[PDB]
Paper text:
Cryo-EM analyses show that hZnT7 exists as a dimer via tight interactions in both the cytosolic and transmembrane (TM) domains of two protomers, each of which contains a single Zn2+-binding site in its TM domain. hZnT7 undergoes a TM-helix rearrangement to create a negatively charged cytosolic cavity for Zn2+ entry in the inward-facing conformation and widens the luminal cavity for Zn2+ release in the outward-facing conformation. An exceptionally long cytosolic histidine-rich loop characteristic of hZnT7 binds two Zn2+ ions, seemingly facilitating Zn2+ recruitment to the TM metal transport pathway. A monoclonal antibody Fab fragment that specifically and tightly binds to native-state hZnT7 was prepared, and the structures of the hZnT7-Fab complex were determined by single-particle cryo-EM analysis.
Concretely, the sample purified throughout in buffer containing 10 μM Zn2+ yielded a 2.7 Å-resolution cryo-EM structure of a heterogeneous hZnT7 dimer composed of Zn2+-bound IF and Zn2+-unbound OF protomers (named IF/Zn-OF heterodimer or Zn2+ state 1). Another hZnT7 preparation, which was sampled by exogenously adding 200 µM or 300 µM Zn2+ to the above hZnT7 preparation, generated two types of dimeric structures: 2.9 Å-resolution cryo-EM structure of a heterogenous dimer with one protomer in Zn2+-bound IF conformation and the other in Zn2+-bound OF conformation (named IF/Zn-OF/Zn heterodimer or Zn2+ state 2), and 3.1 Å-resolution one of a homogenous dimer with both protomers in Zn2+-bound OF conformation (named OF/Zn-OF/Zn homodimer or Zn2+ state 3). The TMD of the Zn2+-unbound homodimer also displayed a highly similar TM-helix arrangement to that of Zn2+-bound homodimer. In the OF protomer of the Zn2+ state 3, the Nε atom of His70 is located beyond the range of direct Zn2+ coordination, and some extra density is seen between His70 and Zn2+, suggesting the presence of a water molecule mediating the interaction between these two. The present cryo-EM analysis also demonstrates that the Zn2+-bound OF form has structural features suitable for Zn2+ release to the Golgi lumen. The luminal cavity of the Zn2+ transport pore is open, whereas the cytosolic cavity is fully closed to prevent further Zn2+ entry from the cytosol.
Residue numbers in the entry:
A (entry chain F), B (entry chain E): 1 to 218
C (entry chain C), D (entry chain D): 1 to 215
E (entry chain A): 22 to 57, 70 to 132, 136 to 162, 226 to 259, 266 to 376
F (entry chain B): 22 to 162, 226 to 259, 266 to 376
Amino acid sequence: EVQLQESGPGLVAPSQSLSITCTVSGFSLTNYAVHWVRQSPGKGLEWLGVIWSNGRTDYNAAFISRLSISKDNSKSQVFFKMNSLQADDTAIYYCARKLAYEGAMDYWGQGTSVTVSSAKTTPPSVYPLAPGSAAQTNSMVTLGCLVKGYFPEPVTVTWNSGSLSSGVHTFPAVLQSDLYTLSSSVTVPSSTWPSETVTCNVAHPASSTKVDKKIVPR
Amino acid sequence: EVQLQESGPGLVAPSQSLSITCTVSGFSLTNYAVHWVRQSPGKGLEWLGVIWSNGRTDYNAAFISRLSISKDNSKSQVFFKMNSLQADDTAIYYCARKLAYEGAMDYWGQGTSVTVSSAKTTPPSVYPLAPGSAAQTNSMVTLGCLVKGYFPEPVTVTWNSGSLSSGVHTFPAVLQSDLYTLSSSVTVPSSTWPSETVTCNVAHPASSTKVDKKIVPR
Amino acid sequence: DIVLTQSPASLAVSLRRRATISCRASESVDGYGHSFMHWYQQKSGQPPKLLIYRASNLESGVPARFSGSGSRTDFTLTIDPVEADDAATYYCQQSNEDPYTFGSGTKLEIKRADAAPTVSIFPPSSEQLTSGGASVVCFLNNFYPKDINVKWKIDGSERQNGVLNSWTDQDSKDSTYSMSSTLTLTKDEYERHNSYTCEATHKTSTSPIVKSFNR
Amino acid sequence: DIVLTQSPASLAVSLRRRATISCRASESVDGYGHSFMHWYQQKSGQPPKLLIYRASNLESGVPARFSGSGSRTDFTLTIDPVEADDAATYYCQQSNEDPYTFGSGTKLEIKRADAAPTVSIFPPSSEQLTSGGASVVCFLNNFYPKDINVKWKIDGSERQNGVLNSWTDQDSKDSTYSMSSTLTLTKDEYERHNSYTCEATHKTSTSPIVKSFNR
Amino acid sequence: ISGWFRSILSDKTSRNLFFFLCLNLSFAFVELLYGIHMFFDSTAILAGLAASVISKWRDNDAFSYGYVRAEVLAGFVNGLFLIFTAFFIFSEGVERALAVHHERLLLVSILGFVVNLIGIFVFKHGTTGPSRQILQGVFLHILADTLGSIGVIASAIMMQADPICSILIAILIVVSVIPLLRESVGILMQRTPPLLENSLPQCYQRVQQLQGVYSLQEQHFWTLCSDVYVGTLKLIVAPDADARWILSQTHNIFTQAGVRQLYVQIDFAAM
Amino acid sequence: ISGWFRSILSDKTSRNLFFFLCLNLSFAFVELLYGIWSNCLGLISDSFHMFFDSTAILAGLAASVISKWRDNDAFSYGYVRAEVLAGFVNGLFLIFTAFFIFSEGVERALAPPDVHHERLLLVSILGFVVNLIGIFVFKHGTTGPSRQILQGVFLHILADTLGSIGVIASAIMMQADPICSILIAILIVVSVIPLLRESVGILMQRTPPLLENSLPQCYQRVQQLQGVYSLQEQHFWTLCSDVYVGTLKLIVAPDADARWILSQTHNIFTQAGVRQLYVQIDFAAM
Ligand SMILES: [Zn+2]
Ligand SMILES: [Zn+2]
């Protein structure tokens, strides 16, 4: 049950500091090292640094001047601080436990997307997505909801709170006018809809938006 | 997915050999060690031996003369051979993977019970056991099937092939006249029975018995 | 050989309290700053599960409620808080000298509010009637504590020759106990006789629970 | 710094086949009989998963179909047989010299017989009409291969100014692809026109699949 | 300057060596006053006192082990000094045979023999712990000095041969100093300690019996000072061997054998 | 027996030392044949002088032969320290040779020994010629145990030349030799001092002078390795001439890569010239 959770700000304006806290479970920080790794499309995977059991920390040679990693064994949290952000550091940061006695990282955490921009957080506007005409109905019918008007990444779209996890296709988002557009599709049996209600729960951790909305046919 | 499976004879008559083959998956025998531990009710847990990656083996000082452990890296099986089986050798034999760089064992396999006696194998006689009168029915109604006349241990009793696993009570067996009796009890909703069929499949690996019995109310 | 003695042999602890299991070694299992003492957990019908290695290190994937302490001969396994799932047998193992040895396990009994058994008696079945024998089972389910007695009355007659009893372990879900009483009789021994009643004497009720059949 | 170059950048392999990914190191990552090169697997939207540590040792809990080999500067990751779940990006990481450096990942593509996309068109919804804009999106689901183009017909006219395309990566169950095409419109030019159709060019059928509505 | 006497007063072996240096320095002044080998003897016990002084100095970067090998070097140089003293005494006996003033009849040699008797009564003996070698050196030196004293009154006995007595004393003191030079050469050549050599195959078989140890190699043991043994060792172990336990057991096994400083390198085999 | 001459023919320096030993043995025979006459007064004197010379070169040759022997249980490191021991003993020989020639000059100044017909004068020319042929022959400027054998005998022959020209200066004076004896003794002791200092440094387990400068940088580099907490009990010393033996203890993290740390430490100290290295790695408790 080894768990690594990270909590950091999704949006950080350029030339300020970024603070990420990695909370660990299932193992002790008094006998394990935690590495910090970020992944961005432009630079692939990059290694930031490592914090050891006694507090010794080894950083990357390029990032030595603007990186600081701390630790506390009591509440099992590793604090990641990086100063003077630019647009380059827009990457998915991970905290990973070091594989014991080897130089690899066995257990990672769900990476937190950190975006460096001067714009403002926008809560999403979710719109359902329904067939135009109730004609040519087959055994399988496509359905979805469109999420337009949010910043920054990410947005979690969940159908019926995970009850219907089959046939989901959450397409990757795209950038236009300094703004993200997201599309989601779920396929449901024609006997089920509209006999059974279908909703998508759209989660935006940056704006703390948990709007839940039902699909109404026309 | 680290898996260790032992396969050996349930009965070994006194003063012949016992051969157990431990099949491992999820790790490689080329860089991991396998210990052998047996749990005799009276002698508690006992460490028998260990086989290392290069084939070096270390045995207990008590059993060194009559114990031999082999390994094949290719098919990932560890062979446990022991001569001179007496009555005190009756124990549940485990093959366990050695925790890397520590003196403990992290992953154990489901032990195989080995009984040393001159008695012969007896297939079980399973009798479905039902309430005498369909009176004083409550929200809960107890049900069970009785397993009598089998040798040796163990016998697996499962309700509806594991579909219903709540309320099961598989009682430990006892010895009488060089034979075993096992009793199983389960509670089921009174609306479910006898509306829905309830069967117990009784497994005796020694006699290869897979008799399935229906509960019939009187 | 290093003999490991565990005290107490059995321990009773309620929910959410503290459980302490101590292991004592005849000679030291300590070398150069490390104590090579390991703690295992064995639930019923399961292989032992490693909790602590080297007497202070939690195995990856175990809950933080398990703790280890001690050095040289003395060691302590501490559970805080105690879960209902923590009802099992705990062993201390040393790896300091060959051969590896385990300590006599300490059984952790879970203390909880007393529950009355659900007494049920099932008459012998037709196929075992054709088998030539007779066996009547007496089931007591979900009762606390473990101390309970079965009294066999057959038209008000008491017998103890063929009374067969078996106890299950404490459950990991509701921390209860189950008890099965079996009475084996021959064909005539069952056929001459009519009423079979099981009597369950348990502390929570001075009046024992009566369930019977007449056949 | 030790740079790591992986060849090929993307690999296409069918089911039950053999897939080989090679990692090339500028400097040797070997020391005293051990090579400190590690292999990671990163599927769709989860952090990378360790497969091989020190270039020849399988991580405990991963399938045996993964294999590692190599020394000095040449290393090879082999999947045999290749399942549908193995559609991921594979990275090689060296730990022989500070700082730790990864390689540019290699994407594994699970080759399979072509499948026809399930084209569906959905009109803009009422409350986003109240929002002042219009967005019509056509969904293409479960198709092979990835080379498909979408043609937007508005009353027999072609527009490419507001066409927005999103591409999903290969699914782990049936190794298919899904594609979402969005066309963003304002109120006036949505109300002026009446027919909107989305079309699909796909290799398995020269005849395009057209889904339309007339609102 | 001043601290040297305080260090001399601190050590008991350095305490005798200072006044014993004072007696011949007085004996040199008396002999020089009469005059209007021995200064060599003054040099030898000067090295004996200097070794006892240098020996307990603290370690630094240049001398990682301290200065405890100065005692072995002093025993070695005393043995070489006595070898050369015997050879020159042989030569002097040859000159005596080939070629009388008798001032004081050389009766001062009797009181000299008394001084050597006092020395043999006083110097009779039988990281740290750095004193065994100087005592043996001064003891066999003063024994050679008593034999040289017997040479002259053997000559006095015969004149009422002294070359033959010189032969006898030279051969006897060479035989006496042979064991000291043998031990010093053994120590200075990084030879396995003779007291530790018999226990080493047992220790090798005990370390090989440890769980997970594959091969044992590059075993080097040697003597530092007198009772301090330094050992180096390399182990090949299993890929998943308990290296903490193997290290602790190896250290215990070789500590029970008498090794004070031990370095065990553990290599993990590839299968 | 016979294998020694098969060993004496294996090495250039060994055969040169054997030729030198045979030459002074022949000199000893002829000098003895001269001293069985009545002119033995100084003949026996320089006879035991050259006898010492022969013992010195014999010790050098014995060390040169022994230094190639294989290792055994008693001598774990081999016999490579015989070279250093020979250098040390030859330096000591030259120190007591200085003292002996000091005594010789003193007795030459004090007592007139002149019962002779200058036979030694021509013999002194032969000794000087022998010293010159030696100085021409012996001009130089696990394994590899040969750097110190040459220097000791070369220094000894340099002394022998000075002892030879001492009597030439005496003959020049008579037509003072104690002054020449003082000068030659001081000069050969000054020449000897570096050899004795190097031999004492090697034989006292001192950090090699060619290694002492690089060791702080090596310690800093090993400290910078990932997971290394501390670095302690560092001992480096010279075995024979170019072989440095190092012992080191590391305290690392509870889960540090001991394989990588060991390989990197071996690389770091091998680049500095430490051929034999033992790295003990201790996993710290938290
Ligand atoms: Zn003396
Ligand atoms: Zn000479």
